[PDB]
C-alpha cells in the first residue's frame, strides 16, 4: 500500500501540522491518498506557493527520509528559536507550530543579518521548505524582527528569489490578521542552498532527502 | 441599505452581480448575509476590511463619482482590456465597475502618475488594487516591465507596493492574486498614484460624510 494520511492533507503532512502525526513515514509509496482541502493543513493563514506542483513531485517516491537540516538548538545562536508559537496552530491546548519549521524571533533588541547554508551530501535531491511571515501591523514587525525594512533571499543553483514582506491587516483568519506564505524547492546533490534574511523568515528545521518516480497523482 | 446576496466588499468594489445600482444616499446600518456568494471575484485579501466595514456602517451623505474617467484618464495605457474570467457577467469576462485593470499599450508600459484633489467639500473614499501575477510570463504580457512598483500617496496615507510573482493555489481559475486597498481623502487633500505596473486604478470614487456608531447585521 502507498502512504495514506487521513485527517490531514499533503500540506499539513509535509509542513508538520501538529494535528497530523509527522513520523508515520513509510520509506516508499506509489500514489497518495488524502483529503485535499483539509481541516488541518496550513494552520497559520497564508498561501502555499507551487502547491500543486509539489503534490506531483511527492506523488510517487522510491526513497523518502526526513532529517534535521538545521538543528533547532545549534543553527540559530544569535536568534530566538523557542518563542515561535501561535494560537492558529494549537496542540494540546497550548499554542504550537509546524514540526518541520522554526519561526525565528529577535533575541533581545537585535535581529542580526541571518545567513545559513546547506550542501546536499545525501546523494539525492533534498526537499527544502521555508516560510515568509507578513505581520499585520508595524508594531508586530518591530516586536518580532526589530528591523523595519527587512528582506529574505533564498538562493541555489536551481532557484533564486528575494522576498519583501508586506505589513498589512488582512481579514482575521484563524485569529490572525497577518499572513505567512510557504515555499519549497529541490536541491540536487552537491548543490548549496542559501538563506539570507534580516527578518520575517520561517527557517526550515527538517528537510526531506528523496528519490522520485515518474507518474502518479492524488486520490 | 440592504444589498441582497452581495457583501460589503463586492458592493463597494462593484462586483458584476452586485451590479451598478442607483442605491440610496443615506443609511444608519447595513444588512448583510452571513456568507455572500459575490464578494471579491478576483482572488485576494481585502486589507482593513473590518476598518472599512465600520466606516461605511452609518453614512449621512453618499455620492459616487467617476474620479478617473475610463476614457481620457489613461492615454498612455490600455483601459479597455482589463477583464477576467474570475469576474464573469452573463457568460462573458468582466471586472469591477469602479476599478480599471490597466494593461500596457503595445510594447511599453510608461511610468504612471495621476493625481486627484478633493474638491467635494467632504472626505472621499478611494479604492485601488495591486495585481500579483501568477508567472513571470503574465508580468511581461500585462505590464512589460519585470521589476515594477506601485506608490499611493496622500497627506494622510503613504505606502509603496512591491508585487510578488508566484503561483498561488488555483481559485476561480486564477493562480495570481490581487489585493485591494482604500483610504479616505480629507477635503483639500491630494491623492497621488505612481506606478510602473501591477496597478488596478480607481474608476469611481465615493465622496461621503460619516456618522458615529453603528455596525453590521
Amino acid at each position, epitope marked *: 500500500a502507498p502512504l495514506h494520511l487521513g485527517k490531514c492533507n499533503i500540506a499539513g503532512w509535509i509542513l508538520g501540522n501538529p494535528e497530523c502525526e509527522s513520523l508515520s513515514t513509510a520509506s516508499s509509496w506509489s500514489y497518495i491518498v488524502e483529503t485535499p482541502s483539509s481541516d488541518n493543513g496550513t494552520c497559520y493563514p497564508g498561501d502555499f506557493i*507551487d502547491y500543486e*506542483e509539489l503534490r*506531483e513531485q511527492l506523488s510517487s517516491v522510491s526513497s523518502f527520509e526526513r532529517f534535521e537540516i538545521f538543528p533547532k538548538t545549534s543553527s540559530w545562536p544569535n536568534h530566538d528559536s523557542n518563542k515561535g508559537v501561535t494560537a492558529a496552530c494549537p496542540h494540546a491546548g497550548a499554542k504550537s507550530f509546524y514540526k518541520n519549521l522554526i519561526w525565528l524571533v529577535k533575541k533581545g533588541n537585535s535581529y542580526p543579518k541571518l545567513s545559513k547554508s546547506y550542501i546536499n551530501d545525501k546523494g539525492k535531491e533534498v526537499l527544502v521548505l521555508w516560510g515568509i511571515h507578513h505581520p499585520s501591523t508595524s508594531a508586530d514587525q518591530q516586536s518580532l524582527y526589530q528591523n523595519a525594512d527587512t528582506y529574505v533571499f533564498v538562493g541555489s543553483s*536551481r532557484y533564486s528569489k528575494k522576498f519583501k514582506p508586506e505589513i498589512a491587516i488582512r481579514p482575521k483568519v484563524r485569529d490572525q490578521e497577518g499572513r505567512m506564505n510557504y515555499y519549497w524547492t529541490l536541491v540536487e546533490p552537491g548543490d548549496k542552498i542559501t538563506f539570507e534574511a534580516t527578518g520575517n523568515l520561517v527557517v526550515p528545521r527538517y528537510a526531506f532527502a528523496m528519490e522520485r518516480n515518474a507518474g502518479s497523482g492524488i486520490i | 441599505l440592504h444589498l441582497g446576496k452581495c457583501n460589503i466588499a463586492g458592493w463597494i468594489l462593484g462586483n458584476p452581480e452586485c451590479e451598478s445600482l442607483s442605491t440610496a444616499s443615506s443609511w444608519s446600518y447595513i444588512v448583510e448575509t452571513p456568507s455572500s456568494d459575490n464578494g471579491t471575484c478576483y482572488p485576494g485579501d481585502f486589507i482593513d476590511y473590518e476598518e472599512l466595514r465600520e466606516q461605511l456602517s452609518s453614512v449621512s451623505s453618499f455620492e459616487r463619482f467617476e474620479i478617473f474617467p475610463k476614457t481620457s484618464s489613461w492615454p498612455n495605457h490600455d483601459s479597455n*482590456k482589463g*477583464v*477576467t*474570467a474570475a469576474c*464573469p457577467h452573463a*457568460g*462573458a*469576462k468582466s471586472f469591477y465597475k469602479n476599478l480599471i485593470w490597466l*494593461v500596457k499599450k*503595445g*510594447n511599453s508600459y510608461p511610468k504612471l502618475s495621476k493625481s486627484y484633489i478633493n474638491d467635494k467639500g467632504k472626505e472621499v473614499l478611494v479604492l485601488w488594487g495591486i495585481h500579483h*501575477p*501568477s*508567472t*513571470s*510570463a*503574465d508580468q511581461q*504580457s*500585462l505590464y512589460q516591465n519585470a521589476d515594477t512598483y506601485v506608490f499611493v500617496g496622500s497627506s494622510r496615507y503613504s505606502k509603496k507596493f512591491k508585487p510578488e*510573482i508566484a*503561483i498561488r493555489p488555483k481559485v476561480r*481559475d*486564477q*493562480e*495570481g492574486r490581487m489585493n485591494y486597498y482604500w483610504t479616505l481623502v480629507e477635503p483639500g487633500d491630494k491623492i497621488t498614484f505612481e506606478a510602473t505596473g501591477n496597478l488596478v486604478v480607481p474608476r469611481y470614487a465615493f465622496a461621503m460624510e460619516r456618522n458615529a456608531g453603528s455596525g453590521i447585521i
Partner: antibody
Amino acid sequence: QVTLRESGPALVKPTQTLTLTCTFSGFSLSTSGMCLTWIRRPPGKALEWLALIDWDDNKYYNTSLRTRLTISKDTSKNQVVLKVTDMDPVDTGTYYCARMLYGDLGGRFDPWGQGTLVTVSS
Amino acid sequence: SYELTQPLSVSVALGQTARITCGGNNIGIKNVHWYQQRPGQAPVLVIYTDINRPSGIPERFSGSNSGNTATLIISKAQAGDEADYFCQVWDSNTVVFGGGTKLTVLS
C-alpha cells in the same frame, strides 16, 4: 529578441524514430511561465499538438499519442528534444517548435519557429 | 476532451469585415487564442486571450468572446489576409486546437 530554430529536414523510414532538436535564445526556459512545444501540420489537416515541457521540467503530451512521444531538455545549452517512435506516412508534414507563454492569461504560443519538414517514406 | 468548432471556410469581399467563429460550450469564460497561417509560412499569434493584439499585428485585427462563440474580426479585409486561422485554448493541462478556417477574399 527571441529565436526558435528546428533541427534539419528529415527523411524517416516507416517504423523508425524521428528526433527533432529545437535550439532557442533571447529567453531562458527556467523563467516562470516559459514552455517549449512541438506542433506539427500534415498536408491538409488542422494543427496538431504533440508535447510540451515547462519551466519546472514537467511534461505534457498529446494524449492520443502519449506512448510514442518523449520530450526532454538538454541539461547543457538551450536545446529541446522530441522523440517520436515508429513513424507512419501519416506523420509526414512540417513540425514547428514554438514557445508557449503560460499564466492566468491562458496558455498561448508566441513565437513560432520556421518549421522543419519531416517525410516518412521507404 | 473539449470540443472547439470552426467553420471550414469563410469568404469576404475586399475591403469588408470578416468574422471567423470558434464554438465551445461555455467558451466565454475560457481564454481563446487565434493563429494565422498564410500558405507556405509558419503560424503567428494574431489575438491572444480573446481580445488582445500583439505587436506588429495590423490594427484591422480584432477579436471578441462571449457565450458559446469566440470570434476573430478582420476589418478592411485585404488580399494578404487569405490564410488559415486556428483558435486554441489551454484547458485541463492539454492544448486544444480548432479545426481551422480558410479565409478567402472575394472580388
